């Protein structure tokens, strides 16, 4: 687990053979990570859009571990001011908002 | 309630005598709403920052009802692509992330 929100909900993830920190972001549809090298095929995706779009690489069905929950999901790899776990992966780990 | 994350977690809020919709956004430190008229004193606040800052009006101790919970917190009033409930108000309602 239960994560309170007095601080930014930054968690450790395991991806592309690396440990990284990322923000559990319910405001984000997608997961975007900087400086990960993932294997295999990808397709470009345009994200953002206000003032222009940013092009990133979309990788599908990526194994990723978030707080020791091993799940599978789409990871966008590209420039992001901060690493973000979006709703697409939060559903996989069964993460909910509760009050 | 328990809110799953397959869709954007948009909720009804009651503020400044109006019903509004806003996104429960764990990636946002603060709460920013468009087109609400709040009474009394405020101070300017600079938010954002990437490419420039946005000036908004900061109102403190604002009564707001989020999804049936009456709470008190800081509301920033100004242009925002979408109305956002940030962590500052999620703590007040006792909202947590759980998996």
């Amino acid at each position: 687990p239960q994560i309170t929100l007095w601080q930014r909900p930054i968690v450790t993830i395991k991806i592309g053979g690396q440990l990284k920190e990322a923000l559990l972001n319910t405001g984000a549809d997608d997961t975007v990570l900087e400086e990960v090298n993932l294997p295999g095929r990808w397709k470009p995706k345009l994200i953002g859009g206000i003032g222009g779009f940013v092009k990133v690489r979309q990788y599908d069905q990526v194994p990723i571990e978030i707080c020791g929950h091993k799940t599978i999901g789409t990871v966008l790899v590209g420039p992001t001011p901060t690493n973000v776990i979006g709703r697409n992966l939060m559903t996989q780990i069964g993460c909910t908002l509760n009050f | 309630p328990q809110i799953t994350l397959w869709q954007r977690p948009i909720v009804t809020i009651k503020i400044g005598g109006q019903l509004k919709e806003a996104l429960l956004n764990t990636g946002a430190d603060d709460t920013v709403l468009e087109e609400v008229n709040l009474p009394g004193r405020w101070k300017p606040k600079l938010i954002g920052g990437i490419g420039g800052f946005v000036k908004v009006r900061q109102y403190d101790q604002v009564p707001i009802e989020i999804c049936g919970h009456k709470v008190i917190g800081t509301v920033l009033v100004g242009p925002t692509p979408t109305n956002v409930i940030g962590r500052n108000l999620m703590t007040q309602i006792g909202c947590t992330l759980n998996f």
Binding site: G27, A28 | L23, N25, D30, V32, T82
Partner: peptide, 7 residues
């Protein structure tokens, strides 16, 4: 879309 708010 995907949405932050440093602050």
């Amino acid at each position: 879309k995907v949405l932050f708010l440093d602050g």
